[PDB]
Amino acid sequence: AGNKSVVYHGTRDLRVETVPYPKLEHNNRKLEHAVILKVVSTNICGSDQHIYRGRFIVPKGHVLGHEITGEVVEKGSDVELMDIGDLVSVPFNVACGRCRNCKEARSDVCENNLVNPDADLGAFGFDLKGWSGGQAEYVLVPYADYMLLKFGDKEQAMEKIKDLTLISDILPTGFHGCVSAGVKPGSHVYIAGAGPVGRCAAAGARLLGAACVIVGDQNPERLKLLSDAGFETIDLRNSAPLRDQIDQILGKPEVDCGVDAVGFEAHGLGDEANTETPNGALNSLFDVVRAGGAIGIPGIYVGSDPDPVNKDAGSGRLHLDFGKMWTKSIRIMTGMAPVTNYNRHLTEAILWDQMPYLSKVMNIEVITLDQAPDGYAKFDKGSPAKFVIDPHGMLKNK
Amino acid sequence: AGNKSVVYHGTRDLRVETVPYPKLEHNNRKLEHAVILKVVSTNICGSDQHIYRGRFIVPKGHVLGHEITGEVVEKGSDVELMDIGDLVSVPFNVACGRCRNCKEARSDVCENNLVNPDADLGAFGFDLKGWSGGQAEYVLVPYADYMLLKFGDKEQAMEKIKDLTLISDILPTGFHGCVSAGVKPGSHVYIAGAGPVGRCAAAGARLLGAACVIVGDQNPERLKLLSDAGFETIDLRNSAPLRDQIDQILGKPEVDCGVDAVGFEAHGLGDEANTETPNGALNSLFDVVRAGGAIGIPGIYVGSDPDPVNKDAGSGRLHLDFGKMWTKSIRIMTGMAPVTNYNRHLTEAILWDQMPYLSKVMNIEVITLDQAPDGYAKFDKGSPAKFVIDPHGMLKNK
Amino acid sequence: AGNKSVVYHGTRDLRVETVPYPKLEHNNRKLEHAVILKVVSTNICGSDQHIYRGRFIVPKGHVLGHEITGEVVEKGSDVELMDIGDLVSVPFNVACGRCRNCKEARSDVCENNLVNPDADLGAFGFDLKGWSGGQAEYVLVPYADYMLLKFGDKEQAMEKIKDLTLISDILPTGFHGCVSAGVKPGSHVYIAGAGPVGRCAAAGARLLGAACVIVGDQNPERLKLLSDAGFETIDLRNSAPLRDQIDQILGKPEVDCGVDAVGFEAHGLGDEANTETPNGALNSLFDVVRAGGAIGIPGIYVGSDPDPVNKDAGSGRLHLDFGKMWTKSIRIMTGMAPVTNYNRHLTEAILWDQMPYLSKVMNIEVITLDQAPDGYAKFDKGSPAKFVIDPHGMLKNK
Amino acid sequence: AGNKSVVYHGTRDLRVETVPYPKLEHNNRKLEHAVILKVVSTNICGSDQHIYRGRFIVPKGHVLGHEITGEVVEKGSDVELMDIGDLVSVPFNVACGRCRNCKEARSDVCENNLVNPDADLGAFGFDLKGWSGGQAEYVLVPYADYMLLKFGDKEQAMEKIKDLTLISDILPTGFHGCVSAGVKPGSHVYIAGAGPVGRCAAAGARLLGAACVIVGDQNPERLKLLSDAGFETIDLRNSAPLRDQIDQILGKPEVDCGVDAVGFEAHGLGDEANTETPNGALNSLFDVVRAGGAIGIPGIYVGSDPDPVNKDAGSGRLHLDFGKMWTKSIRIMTGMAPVTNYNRHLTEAILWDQMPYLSKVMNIEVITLDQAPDGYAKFDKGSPAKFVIDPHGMLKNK
Ligand SMILES: NC(=O)c1ccc[n+]([C@@H]2O[C@H](COP(=O)([O-])OP(=O)(O)OC[C@H]3O[C@@H](n4cnc5c(N)ncnc54)[C@H](O)[C@@H]3O)[C@@H](O)[C@H]2O)c1
Ligand SMILES: NC(=O)c1ccc[n+]([C@@H]2O[C@H](COP(=O)([O-])OP(=O)(O)OC[C@H]3O[C@@H](n4cnc5c(N)ncnc54)[C@H](O)[C@@H]3O)[C@@H](O)[C@H]2O)c1
Ligand SMILES: NC(=O)c1ccc[n+]([C@@H]2O[C@H](COP(=O)([O-])OP(=O)(O)OC[C@H]3O[C@@H](n4cnc5c(N)ncnc54)[C@H](O)[C@@H]3O)[C@@H](O)[C@H]2O)c1
Ligand SMILES: NC(=O)c1ccc[n+]([C@@H]2O[C@H](COP(=O)([O-])OP(=O)(O)OC[C@H]3O[C@@H](n4cnc5c(N)ncnc54)[C@H](O)[C@@H]3O)[C@@H](O)[C@H]2O)c1
Ligand SMILES: [Zn+2]
Ligand SMILES: [Zn+2]
Numbered sequence A, B, C, D: 001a002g003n004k005s006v007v008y009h010g011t012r013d014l015r016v017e018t019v020p021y022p023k024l025e026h027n028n029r030k031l032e033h034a035v036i037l038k039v040v041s042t043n044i045c046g047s048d049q050h051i052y053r054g055r056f057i058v059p060k061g062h063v064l065g066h067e068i069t070g071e072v073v074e075k076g077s078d079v080e081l082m083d084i085g086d087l088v089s090v091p092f093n094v095a096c097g098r099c100r101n102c103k104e105a106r107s108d109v110c111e112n113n114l115v116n117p118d119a120d121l122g123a124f125g126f127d128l129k130g131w132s133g134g135q136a137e138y139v140l141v142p143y144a145d146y147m148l149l150k151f152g153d154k155e156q157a158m159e160k161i162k163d164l165t166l167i168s169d170i171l172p173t174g175f176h177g178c179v180s181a182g183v184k185p186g187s188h189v190y191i192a193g194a195g196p197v198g199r200c201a202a203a204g205a206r207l208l209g210a211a212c213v214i215v216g217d218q219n220p221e222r223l224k225l226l227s228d229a230g231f232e233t234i235d236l237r238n239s240a241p242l243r244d245q246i247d248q249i250l251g252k253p254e255v256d257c258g259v260d261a262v263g264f265e266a267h268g269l270g271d272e273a274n275t276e277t278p279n280g281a282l283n284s285l286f287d288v289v290r291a292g293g294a295i296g297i298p299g300i301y302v303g304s305d306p307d308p309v310n311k312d313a314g315s316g317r318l319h320l321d322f323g324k325m326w327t328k329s330i331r332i333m334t335g336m337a338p339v340t341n342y343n344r345h346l347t348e349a350i351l352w353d354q355m356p357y358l359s360k361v362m363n364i365e366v367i368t369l370d371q372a373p374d375g376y377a378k379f380d381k382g383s384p385a386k387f388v389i390d391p392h393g394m395l396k397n398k
């Protein structure tokens, strides 16, 4: 036994410690549909940062991480498509493939009460519900035949591992933000957020063939990653209206498509740039998206905030410019991305060299498992890095 | 001679008076593509009631009405598909058919500055912008070849005029609310609002083949029209939570599809049923719609409200349970319905006897022009009637 | 042990005989995802008739039937959503729920080589591949958690069993024919074929809210079932062009939507009505579907015909009016219906009393297992009945 | 003065001659909505070649050409969105924007009898019906406000005129072939045909973000344009089966998406590569497209062929492997592309430098009007050029 893991102990308190080796069981029942993986690469996410800041509650002693790439080392008796030694991508959604929502390709909202008895959605490292994260040496994956995405050729895949470690979550998430917003060839896109998800949303928009892709953020170092790769950027510390700043880049003060890659810990614009306000990103999108336009919201919004900037935000009640948005007949999509719907196509785009701008924009930094809390802390302070943990040293060395 | 019209003079002050006969002209500019209509039937809407209550601003002297069925009596030089004497349905949307949005079947948000120099949307009787309403003996209609839906068989159409008078606005609007929420055969649907729009949404859902259609309203008289036609109804004055009341009908406390047929003058639930709350209908739908579900919002929400219930609502900023909604990966569609997308199909459904229940749920009452301000008053006090004005005594049905 | 089954022995040679009790195994491997069902109701299909006529090859000793409703009597260790005693519907598609096509809600074309190693599709009673049919007392169903549709309340379901026995195959198939052809409220539909599938396609079109639903067939007794239920019919023995016959019913010589519920054993029109010609139904649809229209093809077309009317038809090569069809920018959908995509919604439509015309149109006749060959023979001679076998006498007696 | 035009006089007999200057008139009827254009650039198409070879009938004296970019020099009374001097792109589709099909964004199949009194479709230079082609100094364009795509920045547009001259027809057509086949990011695509249309399909697929784009042609020169730009190519003169040749490139003998950019004058494969067979491209796609896949057919197929290779082909009856296709549940889209649906977006993609590879694959050659019949002759003998006529010396690019 022995599994070294990133374990939650409290607000900004993460401890790398050895827990028992994962068994093929959940809630004291054998899972013959499940596999154990030896973790190849495992990233740190802005969703993990919500937990780290104490803005998303998990039980003390919960293992974090939901961006898993690994190798099958053990399987139950009902795993018929995965072999020991297979290199695979794990979607962050824990989904059964057997319930109504899974059968209608809506694995983002799995209804199976064995995945989550208290709500219709599953996720690693979020306690949704009771699935250990993958910021560890090993991890249990239920429903392996449905869940896992095989990287057919190990050698082809490992040479692009820094790109393919994003297939677990954030590229499909950013891409989903774009697709649900109707981003297509020749579209004009504004993305709120230049964290790892927003930078993936920008890369997804380019792959989709968008004409003008503009990204806004208060963080100039994160934005520089994008503008160096040919993307248009807006510094949101500027006091001039966002519409006017778009108008200077585009020739029009409005965009076809808006993508919210920020979430509930959003900040304001201009002199509000250092003020946390949960309606900051949303209301800016309602403002800049044109009549007949659409909005995707990959950024997380919670039904409960344990430490909100106002009382309403504590119950997920936000103060939203709905009337303005309604008048423009804007369409909105929300929620966890159904990674299973996009992961295969996005992998094909990477392996066939369609995304050379992805690594340029992502700023991947490979760290060890012991270095992870330092990574979280650096990320918490606005680092322009995407931290990827290599718990077995399988990624050579740079 | 003069054109007798319903004219707005102030809050709850409408006057049936003569206005100069309509010319084929707008802002002194000659309209080659336009037509004059002798009005056959012209309805009163909940949207007109917003104006009537002083909650939607139009200028003093503005002619009201946007639910027009009429006969062509005059045509400009560039009208090739309409003849004098043709019975037509007018979409409430003023739309050119020539701009980008119109060309992409989005006539709800016409971008033509000659239709509306400011916002991207056109509509009769809402000053959007400067198009006179059709609650009158005669009405100007621009871009006639694009705008108008001609009933091929005039006599057949006239025998179903009480159903077809709804083709101008509220049937396509309610139907759009359903379609945009993904209402399809076997669907479970909750509709907020049992006014004429909500009743048309219910009729549209039946036509779509929905399994279970539930309509909620604080108004009992309005709900009984639906009850008597085999629709499920919830009395929103009841103290019990809506989810549980839905549970009692359906067997599940959640629906596939939510339709908001109320708008910004919404009231609360149970003990707050006599209290106005602009978030009342929206938050109820965020609650009762299932994970993976969808919402259509045909009810109007405005960017500005002159007499709001709180200061935020004055600028169309609502307090919405966006977190609850987001967690369920719910999709939302908003805005004026693009009537042209649905009016032909819905006409065909009526003409071929697919909607016998429509007249049953609608409670059409036929009045004269002189009776119109009395119609508005009864409607404003919660009347279960759908008022249809007959300016030239052309209906004589009852 | 002991399982009395309809067994194929040759052209028009079916023998009811007792075979070994089904085990939870396939190709000498244990299936822990599978269940054994005690068969409640099991229908005879026009697809079975292809086998019976010797036009679709299965091995001698193959058990026929793919329209299964049953009760779970045994389950493997990885069946987590189905309980012993559950009343369930079995989609005719054998699908794994784990391959790429199944994950993208395309269970009609399962790629799993354990379902079918030789082609990307699975089906009971077709040797696709090696899955015994369900015209028997018991039947094995693989991948039970993904495959099966639970009828939650046994008592509610059994009172509608004559309707719900169609949920396994032909209602979803006919409905799929309509949906893929864009049948929606107010549509004008022509359906080729008034066998059980075509009569389900007509019932599906009504549920969808179609304005005019016209069905064509040479068989007048099958057509009478439809016209007695308010549908429009065309006798294809008539020598007048189909377009003109539609024009007499509709007012236009063309329809929005065409549905091919015939297949490769099609007959001609007029004096060709008694001549078998595999392009008979298809070319008629290419003729009567309007510009911008769409066609659904639920009727089976084979890549190999062992006894064709011409040499080309032996290799599935048909002589098709493609140019005529191309010029009208018509869209075509083909293939086995993905029953899993429609079965739940269609069940909801039945249980909520939305389809009272279905039984009126279907002409269900309940027979015993020993009476099955007589049923096949009667069906072969153009019987207007839908034969449903009750192998345990669970359907009372009429 | 006279309008110098390319005029059809018979098979392989075109004459550059003067014709009466265009009036704002059609069938002696005055056109308020129409415009006259001074032609900036006007291309030669494969569709013009069908006419040139005597395979598509037009009357003697008909003016050819339907790939028009021009400047507005005259406008009727009802043209409100175009000004004199405006640089515009003309969709090859003649479409009113006022009929049911046009109003539903289906301008490929305009139903207006004033556009075409017979079939539901309009096009310049194809006698559909009686609209003169744009291979001339001047051209009449009806319904200008609906039809025309105006380039906002005239100078910017002119600097990319060699790319934008394709916006009238072949780029939107090839792009439509891809989109209708479901080409999206990560897609594997096979395109039949490396003429200018097939090359635009390839460029469109790249813009869409396809992983693997394979183009087949018997013509090596035409394929090399694609090869040099990093596209995969298959020499169709090779004896090996196409599936296996695809296997060698892709790793699978099947593609997600098939595009037929050839049409009814298709040739065979391998040893039959110099043999004309109207089913050659279609059957290859029925073979190489996977189960659950889709096909787009931008290549023209006609209801009547005056010089067919067999009697069936004379009435547009083709011998198609429909059985093979059906078994794979493949979807098919056909017909003239609705250019208006794509032209704005594709323009935006060009203007924002998303298509540097377009000029690389297209091999634009600029010729004068006098050189046009020589252009047709070289093109007819398999030239890898895309011929663009410059009637007033307005391009001067090379
Ligand atoms: N839906 C899903 O499938 C799912 C999966 C993964 C991540 N997420 C979410 O995506 C979000 C993005 O996280 P991340 O990993 O990119 O790191 P992040 O949280 O650091 O990114 C947010 C960025 O947005 C910027 N920002 C703050 N206010 C803004 C505003 N008003 N307008 C524009 N930008 C603003 C911040 O400076 C920050 O750089 C998180 O909320 C995370 O929870 C959702
Ligand atoms: N989108 C469009 O194309 C468009 C077109 C026409 C009308 N509309 C809008 O539709 C809305 C309804 O129109 P109407 O003619 O039925 O007017 P209406 O005002 O008479 O109908 C609203 C009904 O909703 C009920 N209600 C109030 N609060 C509720 C709640 N919280 N939950 C459920 N029901 C509640 C009221 O009792 C009332 O009967 C109006 O806001 C109107 O402006 C929009
Ligand atoms: N795609 C699927 O999911 C799947 C599933 C089940 C059944 N099917 C197929 O559906 C088809 C229908 O079978 P069925 O069970 O209704 O019984 P059937 O085979 O008897 O029905 C065919 C009917 O069409 C009539 N017909 C013959 N030529 C015609 C023509 N040219 N135009 C119009 N009608 C014509 C016949 O008289 C006959 O009544 C069969 O081919 C079957 O294989 C496909
Ligand atoms: N749908 C539309 O909107 C529309 C518009 C424009 C053009 N088109 C049509 O598109 C087609 C192609 O146009 P083009 O300008 O490229 O003309 P083209 O004739 O020069 O291109 C056809 C190419 O296909 C090749 N070919 C022949 N048989 C083949 C096969 N079996 N498989 C693969 N390739 C094969 C030929 O060698 C040739 O290079 C024409 O039929 C044209 O009429 C349609
Ligand atoms: Zn994440
Ligand atoms: Zn699930």
Ligand SMILES: [Zn+2]
Binding pocket: B045, B046, B047, B048, B066, B067, B092, B169, B170
């Ligand atoms: Zn209204």
Ligand SMILES: [Zn+2]
Binding pocket: B095, B096, B097, B098, B099, B100, B101, B102, B103, B109, B110, B111, B112
């Ligand atoms: Zn417009």
Ligand SMILES: [Zn+2]
Binding pocket: C045, C046, C047, C048, C066, C067, C092, C169, C170
């Ligand atoms: Zn069947």
Ligand SMILES: [Zn+2]
Binding pocket: C095, C096, C097, C098, C099, C100, C101, C102, C109, C110, C111, C112
């Ligand atoms: Zn499968």
Ligand SMILES: [Zn+2]
Binding pocket: D045, D046, D047, D048, D066, D067, D092, D169, D170
């Ligand atoms: Zn062309």
Ligand SMILES: [Zn+2]
Binding pocket: D095, D096, D097, D098, D099, D100, D101, D102, D103, D109, D110, D111, D112
């Ligand atoms: Zn038209």
